[PDB]
Nucleic acid binder design. Structure first.
Length: 197
DNA sequence: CTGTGCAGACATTCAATTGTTA
DNA sequence: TAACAATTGAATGTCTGCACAG
């Protein structure tokens, strides 16, 4: 929102070159993949004389100066609360990215899923059939039925949940064993609920 | 972490629940 | 022991990964 309207920093000498050249290369090889066009474009940059590479830096440098001025001007025209709002937007954006990266790493190293709760089992089984338009409304329905469940009915699910708790512990034992072996001891649990930490 | 184009991955939204952690 | 993340589901976003250099 504040960050949305915020002046953007200029892109570098090579990235400028890239952005202008890409349309040109795309126009000439329309069925070629972007990744290859970029490899070709990098090559052209690399081949480009340093005098020609200077033109691009000189502009970036000049553009940096405008940014400095635009940023100062923008911040000067903001209120204490908008500033804090802007600081929070940036922090949040950073943390969101750091988070996403940790998750991807784990997914790539094929970390087992966490144990599915009785309620998870219930949602899996009863979702398709729940009354409601949107999946949001359908969940609200399942959630409601779940609340009204006889501990007699709830037990079926609690047993499946106990079954998954077993898989988890097993898959984990194996995965952690593998992690030590690929030298990623950092990814191990410091504390295990149903085993030695 | 920025630019591009796209394919495919992933976060949000409605909730509750729970292992792990601080 | 509270708080955080990740699960169950899907539609509907948005964001990354690749090919690069700065």
């Amino acid at each position: 929102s504040v960050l949305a309207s915020c002046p953007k920093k200029p892109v570098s000498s090579y990235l400028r070159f890239s952005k202008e050249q890409l349309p040109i290369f795309k126009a000439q090889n329309p069925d070629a993949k972007t990744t290859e066009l970029i490899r070709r474009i990098a090559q052209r940059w690399r081949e480009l004389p340093d005098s020609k590479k200077k033109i691009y830096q000189d502009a970036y440098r000049a553009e940096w100066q405008v940014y400095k001025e635009e940023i100062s001007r923008f911040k000067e025209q903001l209120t204490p609360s908008q500033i804090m709002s802007l600081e929070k937007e940036i922090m949040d954006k950073h943390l969101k990215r750091k988070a996403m990266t940790k998750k991807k790493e784990l997914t790539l190293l094929g970390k087992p899923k966490r144990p599915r709760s009785a309620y998870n089992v219930y949602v899996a089984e009863r979702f398709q059939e729940a009354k409601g338009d949107s999946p949001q409304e359908k969940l609200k329905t399942v959630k409601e039925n779940w609340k009204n469940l006889s501990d007699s009915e709830k037990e079926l699910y609690i047993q499946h949940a106990k079954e998954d708790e077993t898989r988890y512990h097993n898959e984990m034992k194996s995965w952690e064993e593998q992690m030590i072996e690929v030298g990623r001891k950092d990814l191990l649990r410091r504390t295990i609920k149903k085993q030695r930490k």
